[PDB]
């Protein structure tokens, strides 16, 4: 499996690492890839796209890297299974509600409830691991 994410301070990166840990604990392998290093062709071959990005600007996906990435894969993911996650601060998940609607609009099948964690995981570390385990069970 593959996890692709964007993180500005490391919070979403930490989530990605924990999600990977859950998948691995379930007995499977998974590679964690920063969005700037992603290879689209290899990504689109995946059974499940695990995508993460923190809340940016005013409740939107990060604009310089993650957003263009989503726009690029948008027309070649209809029917693809996807799982979404990200860290946020002061809001209550609007950016993620929009991210989910967006992916559904591209024809994707959102396999689990998107995982959103406030700031660094900390107490929510296990929640991140469990999300990975659910994805590994699909
Ligand atoms: C420029 C900027 C804008 C942000 N906009 C939002 C927002 O609209 N809603 C929210 O809840 N958090 C917002 N945040 C807070 C981040 O989502 C939060 O700090 C998160 O933990 C960062 O994760 P990261 O290290 O993976 O980037 C913003 C942070 C920055 C730097």
Curated annotation (Swiss-Prot):
SUPFAM superfamilies according to UniProt: Flavoproteins (SSF52218)
Alphabetized InterPro entries for the sequence: Flav_short, Flavodoxin/NO_synth, Flavodoxin_CS, Flavoprotein-like_sf
Keyword Hydrolase set for record: no
Pfam families annotated for this entry? Flavodoxin_1
PROSITE patterns (alphabetical) = FLAVODOXIN, FLAVODOXIN_LIKE
Record's keyword terms, sorted: Electron transport, Flavoprotein, FMN, Transport
Q: What Gene3D superfamilies does the record point to?
A: 3.40.50.360
Cofactor names from the entry are:
FMN
Under Gene Ontology molecular function, one entry of this record is:
FMN binding
Q: Where is the Flavodoxin-like domain?
A: 1-136
- Identify its protein family: Belongs to the flavodoxin family.
- NCBIfam families the UniProt entry points to: flav_short (TIGR01753)
The UniProt function text for this chain reads:
Low-potential electron donor to a number of redox enzymes.
Stated name of the protein: Flavodoxin
Q: What is the species listed in this Swiss-Prot or TrEMBL entry?
A: Clostridium beijerinckii
């Amino acid at each position: 499996m593959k996890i692709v994410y964007w993180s500005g301070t490391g919070n979403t990166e930490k989530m990605a690492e924990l999600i990977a840990k859950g998948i691995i604990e379930s007995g499977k392998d998974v590679n964690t890839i920063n969005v700037s290093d992603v290879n689209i062709d290899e990504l689109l071959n995946e059974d499940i796209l695990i995508l993460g990005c923190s809340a940016m600007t005013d409740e939107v996906l990060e604009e310089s890297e993650f957003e263009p990435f989503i726009e690029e894969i948008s027309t070649k993911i209809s029917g693809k299974k996807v799982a979404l996650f990200g860290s946020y601060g002061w809001g209550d998940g609007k950016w993620m509600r929009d991210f989910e609607e967006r992916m559904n609009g591209y024809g994707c099948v959102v396999v689990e409830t998107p995982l959103i964690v406030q700031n660094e995981p900390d107490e929510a570390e296990q929640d991140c691991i469990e999300f990975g385990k659910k994805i590994a069970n699909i």
